[PDB]
Subunit: 228 residues, 4 copies
């Protein structure tokens, strides 16, 4: 009982629990690391992909440690620590600007009722920038070589996707056109934007699930499979 | 001397330009004068002593051939060259292949004025039965969704900018000297971007320090 | 106060204790992992580089887990988990062929007294290939895309360096010539061969946990070799 | 059709070849006939329908220019090109710039016979006061220790082989179609390597190697 393989395959996996997520504060570009539970989340994701027989040619991550660490753990489980890995800031979560580090109570104080509803249901609401005196995650040395004009300071989800999309088109798509299997360890908002883009959707997945996109040699999407 | 240097150079006369039709992505090649324009551009850069670590071009032949000629004059045929569609001229859609009179018949008085003076007017897409330059096999591996069909200058820059930021800026931050052989609209958009805002045969020279501050913009000519 | 910096810098680290090392068997390409102590060796090496202020533009490892895992830990300590990393089989330890997995007693049985002395003091003695029925580490799926003719089966140290040298020249030197700071997490024999090549030492002429620092000018002249330790 | 394809082409007439002197790394350029050789070679590949994913050349101008002309004929000027010194012709050292008569004066009777019949004779290095082609600024970023000065054909292949294994084989394993514009000695060494020959084609022919997904050589076709 064997199944015919696709020409190319894209697997998108979400990173596990970060310390900010556990403390219920917004992180965005704040470089919060995995908790012990988040490390176990990464081991579980690696075992999920191994049980489906995935062998990847390349793995992508954001510049954020919770994504990079998840990638390393997953590749460790898959016995693929040797494969090419690529990290880039354009796969980063939204930069939340002023909202960086806020909890639920501070969000409700900062946003009007109407703004909060748009913030939850839509993708177009842009947070304001980091305040004077607020530690801004993008002042990190890891960003020292980027064009300063391009560094975001308060991003809606739409704006995040406008700067992630060129990276997806210029780095991930060409590898899929070569017939490769590509893994991406990703933030939730980025994963959902990529899913919407590929399926051509218009404007909620169980924790620990992965998305499997299968393509033919003309980059037609043949199937989207959820594995868990 | 500066920490890094970017030289931008425009390609020379194309056959469409000589016949006074609009090309956009239409893959028109250099005329005899366009070839001599490239040799003269090479001699201008050689007289200023430029030695480049890398050269960029668009996916369009008039840009690629100019790069090859320039590098030949500079005795740098061996350096790395990179061509990419994101540096292409605007895709003119319906206006592709039209001459000046056809542009007026197709565009109203207001549309033609904004098309001439501004950057925001988007031409309509190619008509049915019109040869679309993006159907070229050289674009067969691009994400089908990203291929344009009718672009304003603003739209062209929105897809060229990520390439400039991701391929050009990192090399300048490494201290390299970078050459770009570009189309007029792309060169003007890059200049406007870098300066936070030219006579034929001229070249733009951008000098940067190690924080990527623009120290000077020099126009060199013969 | 401050010292004038070199144009480019190459730091070479050795990986820490592997399980084969703890059990006193030769590994070579056998993909033995770090022990708990080897993991702590990697954290300590990271702290060493952190106290000397190193910020690398790129890090290289072999295809062997014990080297890759050491690289990951060191970059974690350095807060450089985002930097580019490159792994390649040409930085692998010698493929020990038949000697793979042997302990001291089996080595002494297999080699003559003359052969053993040359084995310890020289770099030219080549082991035989893996025997029939012996598990060969190169049959690992991670090597499936290599040219089958290039895969070694029993290497002397000289032979190891003959296939590592082109990688050093084609991938590390060009980045040093760009002015970059390069980290290599290496195997002991590979580190020693690189040191010999760079210093122009003869075949005639570091404590555990030490690192080698090579400093170069823009013509790739070796300006200094510094040994650093805690 | 095969999983992957390698085409190797030799560059056309250089000025040194026309003058019957040995160039090696001497950076002699194509003649007007040599440029026509490149156009002819391009038309040969076009008539067989080749569409390449990438093209390789040496750092020598006669190889680079041939690559550019061939890609012009193929309507593939946009494809990725890679040039590298490891695909260079032998560095002839002292023999650089010499003609047939001078090589007789320099080499003994035995040495000249080894030079013509075998691949193992290493020429001596460039003489004092002899302009060395490796002093070219295009080589300024190489490890100075690696630069040759007098290379037998065997030595040339020892430094070209790792480039073939590390750059060309992985792309053939990816299922790509690869073009190499090469020098005769380099082309012959690659052919011997791929066919496993032990240690005679028209000037304008091309070699076509067809492979399956395990990198088994299914067939070698000569087109002219
Ligand atoms: Cl050596």
């Amino acid at each position: 009982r064997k199944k015919i393989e696709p020409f190319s395959t894209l697997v998108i996996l979400r990173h596990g629990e970060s310390l900010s997520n556990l403390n219920r504060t917004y992180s965005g570009w704040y470089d919060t690391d995995l908790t012990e539970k988040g490390i176990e989340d990464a081991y579980a994701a690696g075992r999920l992909l191994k049980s489906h027989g995935f062998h990847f040619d390349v793995c992508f991550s954001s510049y954020l440690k919770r994504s990079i660490r998840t990638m390393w753990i997953v590749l460790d489980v898959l016995d693929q620590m040797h494969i090419q890995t690529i990290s880039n800031w354009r796969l980063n979560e939204c930069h939340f600007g002023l909202l960086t580090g806020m909890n639920k109570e501070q969000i409700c104080t900062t946003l009007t009722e109407e703004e909060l509803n748009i913030w939850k249901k839509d993708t177009c609401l842009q947070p304001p920038p980091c305040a004077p005196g607020q530690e801004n995650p993008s002042d990190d040395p890891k960003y020292k070589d980027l064009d300063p004009r391009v560094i975001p300071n308060g991003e809606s989800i739409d704006m995040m996707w406008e700067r992630a999309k060129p990276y997806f088109i210029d780095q991930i798509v060409p590898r899929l056109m070569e017939g490769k299997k590509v893994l991406i360890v990703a933030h939730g908002n980025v994963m959902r934007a990529m899913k919407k883009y590929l399926q051509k959707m218009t404007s909620v997945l169980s924790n620990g699930s992965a998305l499997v996109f299968k393509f033919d040699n003309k980059f037609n999407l043949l199937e989207t499979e959820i594995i868990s």
